[PDB]
Design a protein around this ligand. Structure first.
Ligand SMILES: Nc1ncnc2c1ncn2[C@H]1C[C@H](O)[C@@H](COP(=O)(O)NP(=O)(O)OP(=O)(O)O)O1
Ligand SMILES: [Mg+2]
Ligand SMILES: [Mg+2]
Length: 430
DNA sequence: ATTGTGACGCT
DNA sequence: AGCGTCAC
């Protein structure tokens, strides 16, 4: 009772841009705005691969990983924007620079952890304490939360979406104990006010819309964020967790979407997150290891301790290209030319990074895939990165991988290569 | 013939 | 260090 921790010590938000690469292209080209449209990589094979889809186009069934020719079968009027190509490969610079725009705005409000090109976690605990003392016990108006959903509400004793949203918000606000600056539900609510302000600033200053989750930890904030995408934010309280988890498939929780989550389902004979509460911590550790078992025991109760790391910049800078089917690289000149292409893009990005961010990479990772291997990477080897020079970097990468050529004659490369990858890592201040 | 990223865990 | 998992 009194000594049972409840995981209500922090306020954590997760901000995720809505159809991000699409919004970047729609900002640039107004003809694409408010249309079914998608962003595509390459074009020659089946029209190119779709990597981002506007919500208008999703209504027709268009998804990421679809070929554009097939997407056009579902949506004949689909508009397409193409990823830029440079040195023979897709170049994501426009989206990385748009991401920096958003992350720099978010960093004005709190320390952020860059989780991907379009999402960041925010630790709002301190900002919430400050705003609470500035308030001085004043109630929180629903006008301060114009895009917020309270998960699980309304409940108890209108048929339009916005009406239900406001009904649930009213129920939440009416029950709130504003006199108590240590109430976790009040703390979440103030967190949600701040996240409204943050999202308004992102939209005002970039044109981009986003969704957000506000809860007590990263896993619940991420789950909350997706509950009412797009252009809305969702508060998941500690009290909402039993009902939310009671019908939540295990695979929806971050880190359980793969083999471990399938083994939880298989070994325990359960389907939903909340069913995990019936096992002891030792039982879960016996099946899934000490770390995973303790994590699952706490997470199915809504408790998680993973901190929002103070890290706004990526810690690796990488460049990779697949060479599928008959395009696999089969000569030494081919392998050299593409390592050079990858190394030149890497040198551009690394020089810009050193100027912007006062750091230098010190290790170069070289990874390849051979034809016939079903694994993503087939070989990874490291070497020293001492100079931001594309020819040196590509020569060094070749020296580290040259022994995997099974061919007798040097001029040929066998078995052919289906992926090349260069990654700069191990940054030091400069 | 998804592709091009990126973080972290295990041994 | 090199390999594997998981997520964008
Ligand atoms: N598998 C992949 N391969 C390449 N690029 C990808 C990718 N997945 C995502 N991207 C790129 C394209 C995406 O625009 C961007 C952000 O990924 P999301 O947040 O998962 N998807 P979005 O923001 O589009 O829609 P939503 O409103 O559901 O958040 O990363
Ligand atoms: Mg997104
Ligand atoms: Mg995202």
């Amino acid at each position: 009772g009194p000594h049972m921790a409840t995981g209500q010590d922090r306020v954590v938000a997760l901000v995720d841009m809505d159809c991000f690469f699409v919004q970047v292209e729609q900002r640039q080209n107004p003809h694409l705005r408010n249309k079914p449209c998608a962003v595509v990589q390459y074009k020659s094979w089946k029209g190119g691969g779709i990597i981002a889809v506007s919500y208008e186009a999703r209504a027709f069934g268009v998804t990421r990983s679809m070929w554009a020719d097939d997407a056009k079968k579902l949506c004949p009027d689909l508009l397409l924007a193409q990823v830029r190509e440079s040195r023979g490969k897709a170049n994501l610079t426009k989206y990385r620079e748009a991401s920096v725009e958003v992350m720099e705005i978010m960093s004005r409000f709190a320390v952020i952890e860059r989780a991907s090109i379009d999402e960041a976690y925010v630790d709002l605990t301190s900002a919430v304490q400050e705003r609470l003392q500035k308030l001085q016990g004043q109630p929180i108006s629903a006008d301060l939360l114009p895009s917020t959903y309270i998960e699980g509400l309304p409940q108890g004793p209108t048929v339009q979406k916005e009406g239900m949203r406001k009904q649930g918000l009213f129920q939440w606000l009416d029950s709130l104990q504003i006199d108590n600056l240590t109430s976790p539900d009040l703390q979440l609510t103030v967190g949600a006010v701040i996240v409204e302000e943050m999202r308004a600033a992102i939209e005002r200053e970039t044109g981009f819309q986003c969704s957000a989750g506000i809860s007590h930890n990263k896993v619940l904030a991420k789950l909350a964020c997706g509950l009412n995408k797009p252009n809305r934010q969702t508060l998941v309280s500690h009290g909402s967790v039993p009902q939310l988890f009671s019908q939540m498939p295990i695979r929806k929780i971050r880190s359980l979407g793969g083999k471990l989550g399938a083994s939880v389902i298989e070994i325990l004979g359960i389907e939903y997150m909340g069913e995990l509460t019936q096992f002891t911590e030792s039982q879960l550790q016996s099946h899934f290891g000490e770390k995973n078992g303790s994590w699952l025991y706490a997470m199915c109760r809504g408790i998680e301790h993973d901190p929002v790391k103070p890290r706004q910049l990526p810690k690796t800078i990488g460049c990779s290209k697949n060479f599928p089917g008959k395009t696999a690289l089969a000569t030494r000149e081919q392998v050299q030319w593409w390592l050079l292409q990858l190394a030149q893009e890497l040198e551009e990005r690394l020089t810009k990074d050193r100027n912007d961010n006062d750091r230098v990479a010190t290790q170069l990772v070289v990874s390849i895939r051979v034809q016939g291997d079903k694994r993503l990477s087939s070989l990874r080897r490291c070497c020293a990165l001492t100079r931001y020079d594309a020819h040196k970097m590509s020569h060094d990468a070749f020296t580290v991988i040259k022994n995997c050529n099974t061919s007798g004659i040097q001029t040929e490369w066998s078995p052919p290569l289906t992926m090349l990858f260069l990654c700069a890592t191990k940054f030091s201040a400069s």
